[PDB]
Design a protein around this ligand. Structure first.
Ligand code: A1L8E
Ligand code: FE
Ligand code: FE
Ligand code: OH
Ligand code: OH
Lengths: 268, 268
């Protein structure tokens, strides 16, 4: 390590900015999903029974939202394509990148002012927030969108930021649960797509899988489009449980407990 | 670890929170400091020049905040003591947590809304916000603060949070400059403290170091109160440069250029 007091005693490294590479492995934190595709081949669709008015409210937000989206996206009118898959999935990660961020931060500030230990919830919500971004940079590559969709993103994030921000204030049981179902709805989408290839109801023409994604998911150089999905969907299922476990931890007043999943990924 | 479809497919993990241990490592990301004590020994006090109004103004805004906070915290009143110091820093780290955070959280939303690579900023600031939050997490473990101080912290937090937030949106350079110029003082103060220990005016009793500190900073189980202030001094010296470096890039219409520390920390 050549990181020390000489470098710390400097005023700037603006000097050095025109001689440092744009390496696509510096995009993310050194904190990557490590899957294996035979195994994540068998991620299944699930569903969690709603307990109270909150899990119910959550569920209705998330079904009502879908219906509307499916109709304003025109998505289930006529056949499928690769346009509409990528489009839905690009738009939607813009919104997906947020919750974990407004939650991640809230736990941060909440720690700081009460000077209480966070027992590991923050980073997970932060490294989610990154993940779902990373899906969006990946989807950036396969298809760039016209102004129309670039706008809808802005005005939507504007809205979805705020809502989340104040829901996560009031009942971050509402919000951790609300995510839970959004991941359940997604982990469908991404199977239905993995089952579309299989058969031949859709022709992947991006069997050059983006560089960004290759380094991010550590896929071998000959990965297909399906191979992308399967690792996105696995990540999407990780949150499905994690934000349901978190919504459950709230239900029974365990917001101050240790985030199980820091141990459940390192283990004995 | 064993983290595959079978966990992903099991619905919640509420069941397991009574059986997960509370391991001090897990409080923080794995993305920690890694100093060498005699290297960091020669962390030195530096003062970068203001360029424009923005730089000069941000620099006044720190010196006014130091003049205020010192007199009003009675700090300027005779002899250095161990406890008025831990009180000092404890407070300061509860704010030092915030701007690293709003920084990541604002660049992140931009990334998702304009669909663009971040190129390694988001994560470098987010660890800064964690590093300070960890300083805190150590400091609190040296002294519990009283309600009059628990109360000042919770008021501060909002006034700052919403300061940093509107000032970020407005002018990130101003912030980064402001934080550069804040963290200069961070270095002044912690150096001087070690100038009290090496010497005599301070003869501290907390020469146990809390275990949040030792796993986070990788120190021996026989590290001193000097040593701990010295890595913190290091940590703060890291933060000092980066934010002056960031503001500078922002000054030189270079916002979206790769963050140049993702190499200067990594290059093998
Ligand atoms: C809160 C606190 C104060 C101290 O002096 C010391 C420690 C703590 C503390 O809990 O440490 C912070 C731990 C990190 C998480 C931040 C939690 C602090 C805010 C919530 C504490 C109250 C318990 C949740 C009641 P919230 C709730 C949400 C989910 C599950 C259960 C309860 C609620 C319920 C019914 C009616 C109205 C509100 C709620 C209210 C306010 C903000 C967020 N959520
Ligand atoms: Fe997603
Ligand atoms: Fe998702
Ligand atoms: O998704
Ligand atoms: O600080």
């Amino acid at each position: 390590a050549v990181w020390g007091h000489t470098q710390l005693n400097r005023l700037s490294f603006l000097e050095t900015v025109p001689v440092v590479p744009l390496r696509v492995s510096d995009e993310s934190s050194e904190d990557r999903p490590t899957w294996s595709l035979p195994d994540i081949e068998n991620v299944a669709i699930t569903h969690k029974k709603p307990n109270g008015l909150v899990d119910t409210l959550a569920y209705r937000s998330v079904r009502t939202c879908r219906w509307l989206f499916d109709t304003f996206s025109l998505y289930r009118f006529g056949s499928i394509t690769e346009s509409k898959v990528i489009s839905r999935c690009l738009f939607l990660e813009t919104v997906a990148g947020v919750p974990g961020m407004v939650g991640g931060m809230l736990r941060h500030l909440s720690s700081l002012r009460y000077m209480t230990r966070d027992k590991g919830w923050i980073n997970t919500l932060l490294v989610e927030a990154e993940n779902e971004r990373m899906h969006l940079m990946t989807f950036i590559e396969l298809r760039q969108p016209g102004l129309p969709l670039r706008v809808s993103i802005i005005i939507t994030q504007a809205i979805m930021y705020l809502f989340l921000l104040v829901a996560y204030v009031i009942s971050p049981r509402f919000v951790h649960r609300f995510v839970g179902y959004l991941e359940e709805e997604a982990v469908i989408t991404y199977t239905g797509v993995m089952r579309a290839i299989d058969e031949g109801r859709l022709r992947p023409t991006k069997n050059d899988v983006p560089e960004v994604a290759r380094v991010y998911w550590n896929l071998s150089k000959n990965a297909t489009f399906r191979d992308l999905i399967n690792v996105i969907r696995a990540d999407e299922a990780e949150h499905r449980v994690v934000n349901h476990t978190f919504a459950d931890m709230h239900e029974k007043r365990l917001q101050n407990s240790v985030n199980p999943f820091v141990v459940l990924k390192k283990n004995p």
